[PDB]
Ligand binder design. Sequence first.
Ligand SMILES: CCc1nc(N)nc(N)c1-c1ccc2c(c1)N(CCCOC)C(=O)C(C)(C)O2
Ligand SMILES: *[C@@H]1O[C@H](CO)[C@@H](O)[C@H](O)[C@H]1NC(C)=O
Length: 333
Amino acid sequence: SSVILTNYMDTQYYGEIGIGTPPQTFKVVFDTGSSNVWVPSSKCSRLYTACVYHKLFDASDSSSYKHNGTELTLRYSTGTVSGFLSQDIITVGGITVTQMFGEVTEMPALPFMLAEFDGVVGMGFIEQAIGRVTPIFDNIISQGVLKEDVFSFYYNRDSENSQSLGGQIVLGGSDPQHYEGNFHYINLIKTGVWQIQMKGVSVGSSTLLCEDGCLALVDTGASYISGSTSSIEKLMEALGAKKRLFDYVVKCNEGPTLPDISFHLGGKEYTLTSADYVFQESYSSKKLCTLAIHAMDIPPPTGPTWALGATFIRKFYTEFDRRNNRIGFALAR
Ligand SMILES: CCc1nc(N)nc(N)c1-c1ccc2c(c1)N(CCCOC)C(=O)C(C)(C)O2
Ligand SMILES: *[C@@H]1O[C@H](CO)[C@@H](O)[C@H](O)[C@H]1NC(C)=O
């Protein structure tokens, strides 16, 4: 199965899923950086303005609903949500599965008021599942219907003319329509996390970063490519970028000239061009242009680690292989 995704400003990719009977629809990010499923709850206080602006699941209108009520809290690098657990049938592009998910009752304004999506479908391993809840992908696998134990991500580049798909996720394989060349696989450091060994990061012609090795989390639920505050400070220093509050900028007229940035993964260099990491919204020397690379310190056990988000996946079609515990990259078509 494949789910069509919508691209919002190159920072938010989400698709649709139905929960309950009749199906209550929700926009959700398919996140390889987490393992739980959650959507805003009708029990969410309207004092949380974010709940006023999103679709809310109402168990009272679902005949297939299954109570549980176990409380849980989901911690993301840029925000937290609280709620309780519930069970119901979830429709994911053709596949129907009974799933345990979280009904969020606490959705902080910053950042959720800025989310185009309603919730999250975690594609991570159960090992990282808060509350030891069986992940939706594991449950789908249990049905023995997927042609293969893998799922793929295609994140397109933004577009001013809704007619071009913003992206697509395939359950059970990869769509040859959106990649060329052959996949180059990299074995997972450890099962339980979509993290791999990164052999080095280079800026221009000189591997000035991640020498001796480092970690790379391949996060489909993250907007950018991130590294420890230390690493980025060094990286951004080379690009001549000014550190702001939440991002790093560069004078727009300088964006096009910025050097290539490479990532040494599984014995192949994955190179990004300025056009790939800079939000070139102007050429003016009187305007600032944001970089699609940020500083973000991920805490243990997962961190310290670099994170390969949408900035990376836009260029490289990504396949996640549960069967062989490996990640695959290929030039996105
Ligand atoms: C998905 C859930 C998620 N998963 C992971 N592993 N990391 C995150 N930082 C987020 C996460 C949380 C809140 C967010 C966003 C992401 N994103 C990025 C969406 C990425 O889409 C591919 C946002 O834009 C705003 C609204 C700030 O709020
Ligand atoms: C919620 O589901 C878990 C999963 O097995 C179960 O152990 C727990 O008792 C459930 N909570 C209740 C009381 O419904």
